[PDB]
Design a protein around this ligand. Sequence first.
Ligand SMILES: Nc1ncnc2c1ncn2[C@@H]1O[C@H](COP(=O)(O)OP(=O)(O)OP(O)(O)=S)[C@H](O)[C@H]1O
Lengths: 284, 213
Amino acid sequence: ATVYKGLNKTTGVYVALKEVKLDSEEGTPSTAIREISLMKELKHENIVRLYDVIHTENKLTLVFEFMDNDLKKYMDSRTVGNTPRGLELNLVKYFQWQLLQGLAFCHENKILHRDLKPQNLLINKRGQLKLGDFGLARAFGIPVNTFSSEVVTLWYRAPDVLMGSRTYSTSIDIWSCGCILAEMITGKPLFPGTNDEEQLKLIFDIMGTPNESLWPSVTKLPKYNPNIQQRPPRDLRQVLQPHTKEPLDGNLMDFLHGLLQLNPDMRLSAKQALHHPWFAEYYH
Amino acid sequence: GIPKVILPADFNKCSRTDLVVLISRMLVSLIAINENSITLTRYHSKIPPNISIFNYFIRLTKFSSLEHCVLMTSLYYIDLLQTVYPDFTLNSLTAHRFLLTATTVATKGLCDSFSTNAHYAKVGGVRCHELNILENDFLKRVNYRIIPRDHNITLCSIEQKQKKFVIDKNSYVNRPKSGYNVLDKYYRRIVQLVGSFNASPDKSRKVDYVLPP
Ligand SMILES: Nc1ncnc2c1ncn2[C@@H]1O[C@H](COP(=O)(O)OP(=O)(O)OP(O)(O)=S)[C@H](O)[C@H]1O
């Protein structure tokens, strides 16, 4: 899939032209079918809009609302030369607010993103954040047999999912939000794993190992390790704080813990997340 | 005298074989009635294939391990195409070609496990390119509105290209299961309809499917 920048002729409004050629042993890319398909279902302000599709000969082009850069690009700009650096906390609460808002929407329509990360979070010059690339997403409203898929990075992958789980729900996306957050605060990846083995370790390093009493179902996990070097949870404050120049208040922490549980069922929901005291000021 | 299996309220906990029968039955029933009553579509074959509808379905079902939901969806895709593609009409001259396409598209657009068109084409009995365009066509006539959700057909209807008229014509919140009640709706429907051994494909499976009251 190759994309280009373009702009309406009738309207001056600019757009993004992702190009997916047609005719092949697989004909129309399932990814395209899945993307185009779900996008018509996701009309929300924090979810890149799919303007239209342009079929033609052996070339299909999806016309997305052109967004400037992304959470990833955005931060590098800030401190690409000054090594890792988090963002102003007011700004961390704002972007996190938009991400849960758009995601909250997805989950209500029974759709999981499945691949949330800094770069999959487009931003426009107006500072608006929107969820992107729904190529690996899926409508869980349709009870088919689930199967995780290959991603280029595992820095945002949930532990249980990495442990072979194929029965996860919306919970998978919440974990990513937890990671995304921590990264926005500290400026760098909270679990820079380099493979499923490495990642799990790093996650367990700070979260401790799974607690078969607070998370009994983990034994059902196909890649579970009955006899692994148990570890206690390291405490979050002393892991982040030292790399952030603002007192990580209480709420932020509690919230951060609610998104970063190991036991899926214990992970907060996007709905619940949006109603956590940490966002009180956005109400009333 | 004929057997009398009792099906589960959940089509997932139901025999993939039993579905294909219930679906196939319904399928030749619509073919009977639709013919009981011109311009060709990509789904038209030059003459009725010799292989029965059912014998064609299991094969596609077995050698491509099509999932349950994908089976139902295929059927539902009939009411979707018949509604948004006037020329398309389910009759014993379009069924197969439709079924191939329908089935291979429900799988790719809705499932985690899915094959390549060439695989599908091989099992289906056609040239890959034949299946490519056959899939591209259906996708255009529906505007990639393949997710079986309550208001899908309508939205699809609307989203169609509309003829300007002199006089003007004419959210899933709170909606049960967030609007994913189509596939069940149909499941229940087929058992109520062609549930008994009284359709036409009697020849296939001699069974009486009773769905719990
Ligand atoms: N709306 C957009 N605005 C600006 N640039 C875009 C937009 N969409 C795509 N791009 C560009 O295209 C690039 C990568 O192609 P992708 O859109 O991300 O396709 P994808 O492979 O389905 O998703 P991935 O896993 O993120 S590469 C970068 O995201 C951008 O440089």
